[PDB]
Amino acid sequence: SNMTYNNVFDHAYEMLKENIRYDDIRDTDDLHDAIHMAADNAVPHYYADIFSVMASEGIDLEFEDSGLMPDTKDVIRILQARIYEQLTIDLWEDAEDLLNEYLEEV
């Protein structure tokens, strides 16, 4: 029916797990680019889905870092950048235990 923020975050979590499993990211330095690699293929690209994800709970609509927000008049790119920033913020919390699970996997 509709796509929420939790489904997008689960898809990004699955993509980050797949990137860690495939590319063999061992520390946070490689994971700083792996998180963007997982996030930029999981962001919605049908407009409706974007607004449905942004209209759901769990994710705020303001930038804690004003410099991370791009300087443009495209509103949908601003909301997509907010999605990317919130996804990076929420995945950096789980990055440590994902790294620990990968270390315990091998």
Partner: protein, 382 residues
């Protein structure tokens, strides 16, 4: 709810008195003067129903019996062996758990987890968390002081003892942010239904004068969307109307847009009507980023800081009644005029139907119209 509370028997709680209260499945208006242990009884119920029996390790008692409607009996006893107290939580199903008080105290100072996992396994394998009870404390001004907040539970357990349950109650300084977030999220939901309606109506159009008149009436029908470009496409539709099957599809799309427009804001319009039912000569509304606040018949706007403790109690109680099982309210008569105390239960019973509503009030003005539900507490001193 399913397992409503039928009868609770507390024996020698705090070594002072015995108390046995029978509850109905419906409203339970407990009326009694301060010092009756009403607050204690509410904390006992909230620490029984919501599966947080570990807080009973911080309570001095002899025998606590809780009977639900279906027939489940919970017997809690505090017995000490070799200078160490053990709490025995014996259910009617056959299983029973026992644990040391000092182990729970050490676990609580650890939070400052084996027993917590044991309690979770016990309440999960016996299914003791079917019905969750919400706790409305009588000290919600303290929750306004440390402005749902999660450190407020630790503050209240710090100054009221560790028997106090989890505190999940909204402050006046949090519901403003919650209302602003919900209004903007509903506007974004309207914009997403606009884009879905556009794609679906494109597919459906790809496949009388009354339909044109209905489209002209629906063109005129704040509730403006966040994506104003779709409001401009609607302006262009109104301009074209000013200048068969596809017209039927257009009419259906406009009708669905109007219906979703009403449905997105209906929950907050219900909460606003619930607030404005009490308030006179002052309207709380969301006039325009969304601004939420008071309005006057003079047209002046004002922040939510002018509100009195009475109106703050109504805001914090009507928001925490709309956002809802068993509901336990402690002292709803605080800082309220007598007419609002008369109509408060009728308003909350109109907005909270289908759940066991237990209220504890010191003023009998709260219990008008429900005098058959008035259970009078009486401490039987040991």
């Amino acid at each position: 709810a399913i397992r409503t509370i039928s009868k609770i028997e507390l024996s020698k709680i705090h070594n002072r008195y015995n108390l046995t209260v029978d509850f109905f499945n419906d409203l339970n208006v407990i009326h009694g003067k301060n010092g009756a242990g009403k607050s204690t009884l509410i904390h006992v119920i909230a620490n029984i129903v919501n599966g947080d029996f570990i807080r009973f390790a911080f309570l001095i008692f002899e025998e606590i019996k809780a009977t639900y409607s279906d027939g489940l009996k919970i017997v809690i006893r505090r017995d000490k062996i070799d200078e160490q107290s053990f709490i025995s939580v014996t259910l009617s199903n056959g299983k029973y758990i026992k644990f040391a008080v000092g182990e729970a105290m050490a676990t609580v100072r650890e939070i400052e987890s084996m027993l917590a996992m044991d309690i979770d396994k016990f309440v999960k394998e016996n299914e003791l968390q079917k019905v969750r009870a919400s706790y409305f404390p009588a000290f919600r001004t303290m929750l306004e002081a440390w402005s749902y907040n999660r450190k407020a539970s630790a503050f209240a357990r710090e100054l009221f003892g560790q028997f106090l349950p989890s505190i999940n109650y909204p402050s006046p300084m949090e519901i403003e942010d919650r209302l602003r977030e919900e209004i903007r999220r509903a506007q974004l939901g309207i914009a997403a239904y606009e884009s879905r309606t556009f794609s679906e109506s494109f597919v459906k159009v790809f496949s009388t004068g009354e339909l044109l008149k209905e489209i002209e009436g629906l063109a005129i029908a704040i509730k403006n969307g966040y994506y104003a470009e779709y409001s401009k496409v609607y302006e262009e539709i109104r301009s074209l109307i000013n200048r068969s099957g596809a017209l039927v599809v257009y009419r259906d799309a406009l009708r669905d847009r109007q219906d979703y427009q009403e449905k997105a804001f209906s929950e907050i319009d219900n909460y606003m009507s619930s607030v404005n039912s009490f308030l006179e000569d002052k309207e709380m509304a969301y006039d325009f980023y969304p601004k939420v606040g008071l309005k006057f018949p003079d047209g002046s706007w004002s922040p939510i800081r002018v509100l009195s403790s009475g109106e703050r109690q109504l805001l914090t109680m009507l928001y925490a009644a709309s956002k809802m099982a068993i509901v336990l309210i402690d002292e709803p008569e605080i800082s309220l005029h007598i007419d609002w105390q008369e109509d408060l239960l009728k308003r909350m019973l109109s907005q909270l139907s289908g759940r066991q509503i237990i209220v504890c009030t010191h003023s009998p003005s709260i219990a008008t119209g429900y005098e058959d539900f008035m259970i009078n507490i009486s401490p039987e001193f040991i």
